[PDB]
Design an enzyme around this catalytic site. Structure first.
Site: not given
Length: 274
Positions: A162, A232
């Protein structure tokens, strides 16, 4: 089959190119950055296997607007030279733009909520994907390719760092922290914070992941809890317990308006749309 003869610079054991970043995880999976790979060697290896890559996106309601740029830029940058099958899941088949594809590339429109997305992969399209592609890559549609994204990513199971967390300590990672959720990860656990927007692997491993995430999401739903970052959060729990065989650097998921262009990124390959 054997690779053919190739002329390229000798790898230098005592003069590594990338000294600024971690290029291998503690479980010996490569972390993919520019300067770690020779794409000619990798292209040979994957072309000799006649590799087919499935690229899967969901484009619902107003997100169909993003398909033209997404597909056009994928044509320029994504797996060029290899067989590609795009799978576009949408509620509006007629709004899918007519995009011209290179040879050996095809697009399928599949007519149809993170849990619903997992059902499509592990249940409804399970046999189809096994018969049609070797690898599945799962990305968000509100993105564009700006540089090479190719067979360097392919492996049984990958996630992507990320872009907001690659330099952060694990306490700062926005994992699900409530033990009542199946996605729970305590403060003293975690390798990386993977982004939900870019993951993939072999068809079999992506199906295993989606089956596991769907089960976990159903358990949470039965217990009246929703994980803080939805898919996620579950992806991060899955990848903690089943280590990915490659990790993609933030070159592969970037937002230049939000995050600029730091020196550690030599290329910005796949990015949020301005």
């Amino acid at each position: 089959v054997s690779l053919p003869r190739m002329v390229y610079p000798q790898p230098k054991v005592l003069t590594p190119c990338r000294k600024d970043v971690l290029v291998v995880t503690p479980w010996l999976a490569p972390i993919v950055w520019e300067g770690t790979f020779n794409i000619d060697i990798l292209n040979e290896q994957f072309r000799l296997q006649n590799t087919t890559i499935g690229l899967t996106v969901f484009a619902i309601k107003k997100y169909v607007a993003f398909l033209k740029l997404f597909l056009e830029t994928a044509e320029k940058h994504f797996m060029v030279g290899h067989r590609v099958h795009y799978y576009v899941f949408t509620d509006q088949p007629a709004a899918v733009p007519r995009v011209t594809l290179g040879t050996g590339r095809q697009l399928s429109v599949l007519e149809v909520v993170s849990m619903r997305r997992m059902e499509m992969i592990s249940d409804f399209c399970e046999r189809r994907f096994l018969s049609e592609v070797d690898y599945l890559v799962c990305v968000d549609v509100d993105m564009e390719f700006r540089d090479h994204v190719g067979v360097e990513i392919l492996t049984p199971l990958f996630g992507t760092l990320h872009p907001s967390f690659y330099g952060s300590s694990r306490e700062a990672f926005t994992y699900e922290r409530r033990p009542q959720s199946q996605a729970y990860i305590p403060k003293d656990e975690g390798d990386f914070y993977y982004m939900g927007a870019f993951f993939g692997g072999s068809v079999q491993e992506v199906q295993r992941l989606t089956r596991a995430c769907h089960q976990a999401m159903m358990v949470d739903q039965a217990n009246g809890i929703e994980a803080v970052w939805h898919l996620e959060s579950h992806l991060n729990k899955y990848l903690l317990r089943h280590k990915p065989t490659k990790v993609l650097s933030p070159e592969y998921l970037w937002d230049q308006q939000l995050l600029g262009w730091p020196a550690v990124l030599r290329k910005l390959r796949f990015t949020a749309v301005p």
